């Protein structure tokens, strides 16, 4: 399993402690993404950030982690776009989108 | 699949968060490369760095990852050169070049 | 393909970023070797290190990777010696030596 | 080729980098063994370890790899014993012993 | 040679390094089995595990490998039972039991 | 012997280690099948999976291996159905069903 997206998750209604942890304006969902190789977090962050309304929280190229905030709908589109591109273009094996 | 280039990607128009993550002067594209064996990231970085105008961001010999910044055209040539050499000379099985 | 040398490469003129990555004195070529089984990187490193003028950068027995620095001529001899011994003595199927 | 010993090698005079890689007391030869099936590295390690003076470096049951240190003479006997038992008792097709 | 048991070996007195490699309580013999087809390692493990006193170390269905620990006598019975069933019932061509 | 079913086995009472190896809910028998040509594991898996209550563990088209879990009775019917179809329809030479 070379190129894998192992997580593409959305937190619809986060809590104070979750917002305070990331440093967000406590208004919107949070999209979380894990993929290998770890460096392609930079490419995932680019596609998530194309929405512009979406705010990039952190991009970790060492662990392969991306997080971003914004309206529930924008986050779902950003995750959906990441999964679709990486699958079709970059030939990744993607996991289904998940909600909490 | 011993000798493989699994990614040879170019980000034409990166965002603040992507630039800030790598520590670039927020002016140009970013070329991303993943290959196995992981040590040959050193050889890929050499061919990408031959352009000189191209700036090597990071070379990870453990994961097999290379990133570099510069004008969209320089990055494409660097990626094209890496794919061509590794394929013809080093007998790698290369993936097609990708744009985002 | 049990016993294989898949890479026996020399980088004649490396760059700052390549030197800084390995931690070399920025003066000489770099010999890169990949072989299977992965443990025989220890035997390859021994033959490369017999030159003494050659400096062993890293030996990875898990991936089957060896790297070493020194004058372009010393590195070529070390790679040539590795290829010749492994082929004739240890009955490996070796790839041709490559330059970048 | 079901049951094969593909390597039964001794490094008479290893170098700092080779010792440092394995984590040995920089005093003696190193015996290297590769065999298939990979699990029988456990049986090879047992026969090499019967000498007791011989120190088992690593036993990899996944790749089929064994390494051990000690006086040049002890290592040769251990390798010779492994080759002789596996050939005569376990019906393996063994390669000749090799020195570097 | 479709259905073959190529190894059915017992290590009467294993060493620290052999125990530490498998992760056993350093008290008893180790039974090692290799057979083709590789999937029938699951059936061999079942017959070895029927003794209950015997502890299954690992079952590899890809390589066709089984290992298990316990008192020398229990391991011999388990190996003897595997050889007898596979030979008589499953119509395998079995190798003789071996001791080290 | 072109078209052969060499194994059509059922494990009535598997153990923790056998379940953990396959990744089953530790409740039911395991049906194991080996046939040549190796690709027809896909056809055998189809007939075993027609029961629906039966869960397909793995289908290997390279080795010609099928495994599946479920109630002892369902597994026996699935194996019986595979043997009957392959024999009568596909003109295979089948081995007798076996229990452990």
Curated annotation (Swiss-Prot), chains A, B, C, D, E, F:
Keyword Transport: yes
Pathway: Amine and polyamine metabolism; choline degradation
Transmembrane segment boundaries: none
InterPro entries, sorted: BMC_dom (IPR000249), CcmK-like_sf (IPR037233), EutS/PduU/CutR (IPR009307)
Annotated Gene3D superfamilies: 3.30.70.1710
Domain BMC circularly permuted: 1-92
Keyword line: Bacterial microcompartment, Transport
Short name of any one Pfam family annotated for the protein: BMC
Domain notes: One side of the hexamer is concave and lined by hydrophobic residues, the other side has a slightly protruding, 6-stranded beta-barrel.
Described purpose of this protein according to its UniProt entry: A minor shell protein of the choline degradation-specific bacterial microcompartment (BMC). Proteins such as this one with circularly permuted BMC domains may play a key role in conferring heterogeneity and flexibility in this BMC.
Known partners and oligomeric status: Has been crystallized in 5 structures (all are mutated, 3 have an N-terminal His-tag), most are homohexameric with a central pore. In two the homohexamer lies flat with a beta-barrel on the flat face created by the protruding N termini of the six chains. In 2 others the hexamer is not flat but has a six-fold screw axis; the screw pitch is 33.8 or 41.9 Angstroms depending on the structure. Interacts with the BMC major shell protein.
PANTHER family: BACTERIAL MICROCOMPARTMENT SHELL PROTEIN EUTS (PTHR40449:SF2), ETHANOLAMINE UTILIZATION PROTEIN EUTS (PTHR40449)
The protein, known as: Bacterial microcompartment shell protein CutR
Gene expressing this chain: cutR
């Amino acid at each position: 399993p070379g190129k894998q997206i192992t997580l593409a998750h959305v937190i619809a209604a986060p809590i104070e402690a979750v917002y305070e942890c990331l440093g967000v304006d406590h208004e919107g969902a949070i999209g979380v993404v894990s993929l290998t190789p770890n460096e392609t977090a930079i490419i995932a962050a680019d596609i998530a950030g194309d929405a512009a309304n979406i705010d990039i929280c952190f991009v970790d190229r060492f662990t392969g982690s991306v997080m971003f905030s914004g309206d529930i709908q924008s986050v779902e589109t950003s995750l959906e776009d990441i999964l679709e591109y990486f699958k079709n273009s970059l030939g990744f094996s993607t996991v289904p989108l998940t909600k909490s």
